[PDB]
A paper describes a structure:
Aminoacyl-tRNA synthetases (AARSs) catalyze the attachment of respective amino acid substrate to its cognate tRNA through a two-step reaction. In human, there are cytosolic and mitochondrial aspartyl-tRNA synthetases (DRS and DRS2), which share only 22.9% sequence identity. In the case of DRS, it is one of the components that forms the multi-tRNA synthetase complex (MSC) in higher eukaryotes. In the MSC, DRS is known to interact with the AARS-interacting multifunctional protein 2 (aminoacyl-tRNA synthetase-interacting multifunctional protein AIMP2/p38)8,9 and the lysyl-tRNA synthetase (KRS).
Numbering used by the authors:
A (entry chain A): 21 to 162, 173 to 223, 248 to 272, 283 to 495
B (entry chain B): 21 to 162, 173 to 223, 249 to 272, 283 to 495
The structure:
Amino acid sequence: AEDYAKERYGISSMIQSQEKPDRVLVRVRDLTIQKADEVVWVRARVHTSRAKGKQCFLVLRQQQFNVQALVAVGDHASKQMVKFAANINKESIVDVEGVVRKVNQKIGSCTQQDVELHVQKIYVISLAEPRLPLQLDDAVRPTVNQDTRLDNRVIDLRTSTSQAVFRLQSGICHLFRETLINKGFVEIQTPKIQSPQLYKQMCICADFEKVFSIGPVFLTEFVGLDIEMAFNYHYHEVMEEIADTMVQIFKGLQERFQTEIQTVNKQFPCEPFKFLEPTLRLEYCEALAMLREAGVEMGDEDDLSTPNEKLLGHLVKEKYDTDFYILDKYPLAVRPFYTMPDPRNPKQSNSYDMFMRGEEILSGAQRIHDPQLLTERALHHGIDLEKIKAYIDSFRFGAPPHAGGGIGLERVTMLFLGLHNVRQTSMFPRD
Amino acid sequence: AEDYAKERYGISSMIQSQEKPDRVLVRVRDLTIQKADEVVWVRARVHTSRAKGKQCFLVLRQQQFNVQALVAVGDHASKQMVKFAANINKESIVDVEGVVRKVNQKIGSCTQQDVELHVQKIYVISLAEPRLPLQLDDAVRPTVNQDTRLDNRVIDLRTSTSQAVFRLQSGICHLFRETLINKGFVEIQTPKISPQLYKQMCICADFEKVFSIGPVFLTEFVGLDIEMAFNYHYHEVMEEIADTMVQIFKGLQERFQTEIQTVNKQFPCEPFKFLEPTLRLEYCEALAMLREAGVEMGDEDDLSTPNEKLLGHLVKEKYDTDFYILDKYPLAVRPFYTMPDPRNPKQSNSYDMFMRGEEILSGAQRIHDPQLLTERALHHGIDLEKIKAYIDSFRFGAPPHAGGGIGLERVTMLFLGLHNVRQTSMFPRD
């Protein structure tokens, strides 16, 4: 009845844009010592809460960042307000007005360690229902299984790890596009109703020259970042561009996303990703030699098995101190019909895979731009020419020599951070 | 022994990466007066050619740009070489070596008008078959039907108009992402087995500012989508969306002028107009405007297409803009997730945006409250059972949020004043 702090708290009216307050909401991550003794408004989630005596301690979380808030009986809060605060369901969103105060000793369990928020006002703007299916702290500790997490995506995506993973994942897309655009590339929009490659090659035959696409690829669905490029005389022109683009991504991530890399590292310990400048390139023959030295028995025209890729990747990592490299000149026999044969060594092909942490992320080649040869290769592979006639015909009115290849975003995210399986890098996994 | 030019021209071996020549191939766009009297190597398409006497003129095309080249009996080329050049099938790709020469009359049929290429060497690196299904000059004149042009896509995409259209379209995507990212957005990848559900999940998962680009749906177009938590009023988002479009329009007009002109030539279009900041009109104001024009409309009626088109014309005449916002549509014509106006309950916190009198975006503040969402869903006669998981995502705290999306082809088409969306779709299927 009496309570003096009544106007300073509670659950507020649903936000329906009835007003535009004159008010600045500061980000948790900007609660530093620079703001000491300033009054601020903060919107955050109630991560957790504890109360004793005349005090309520809260952890206020904004994504990756979190801060301590204290509600204490005095000039601002009544004991009624303290109690209200202590009872706010976890994951509720609150608007808090408080003074930023320096603390004598660092608040070790928060990202904002040098200050705390002394609450003068606190309103629940969105009340969470009491039954949390998942606890955020559980979800991030190095227990919560694949199942509940995948069942409760909205909750799991809130964790500092999840935020880090997908913010970085968006960083990969951004970096890929920007690098490609600055190299003169044009983004294209492939339909899905005839796999991304057919269209990219069409665009090359249509004078596009440098193209990329980013989109669903398919009963599994994933996200492919695809490159196709006309070149002057040698496919190494394209191979090198692709490798350099990967390198710009790794550079950019380590320069701009260090905070998220360190966040994921806290849950899933991983050595920083290593790469050379320029990229290491090895020929198939050298790989065969290395594997044989390790006592692996392999034919000169065999494909690399997964276990052998992993070993070679370990060998390369030991020998060259790199997690990223290109393997070039695969046997023509293991590659797809549209693959250009090697002109010096006719057993081999103008084709390449690239690997991260000993796992294949890209499989490209110089394509065959000549109708006759393409047809000849297709015949050798037993392909019915009738069902690929439209594809072959697209090269008959002049086509430039070209090459390309693509990556899977989730895959590249998983390997860069050294995660357990792609599911850990798919926002909406199935299943 | 008659042909002195034998080594200078011919059909070259198939490019199979058998060599890395020390050779720089210069872009046709770079052939200018600045390069006069330089020897250069150029790779290009034989767009057209003509021959008489001791001379062969070719138009060498490298995408949007083209240059005139001259093979002529002299120190380098023989009669034989001239004859060979004269017989290269159109659309073949050639590697040409030649000197850049200042010409005194503008070569007004080319983009490179100040210079021509005096050929010293010419090789076909890719020989085109003889009978083209489609002539490129026909497909760009204010002639070729939509029909042969969809059958022979690879050829059609080659026209200076297709090049300009799709280069600019890629530029739209770029500017859309870039602006949003600078405003702090995160790109998300939504599955296709619509993005709205998923965008709202991310907002409920504390991502705050998400966008997605990808296929939308029995037709498929490309969607550029935004969703954004805000502080107190959905105008915070509406403004961010409108401003993103402003950044797109500006960047196109700054950086894609030659491609805008290329399309203008084939399909005349007044330059696209917009205000800074974006014009916003409320529903009531639009009704008043339409009534003055003699249209009869109920207060809670949805804007018909003919009525949008008229309204667009009216705002163009009065405010001099091709882009505007209409705010506060009636609640009854909007989707169940649309938040009602807290002040006028017949209206809603919803908006459409228009380019040249046609709708490109339809957004609202969404309902981030489980109870109200459910009510509203009931009102719309939706089975709560089949949207259960959607509602359930708002049960654990959600911020107030708004969003809206555009169609890429549609926005390209309306910016350029084009006739239909097929013109702006790279791979159409009827």
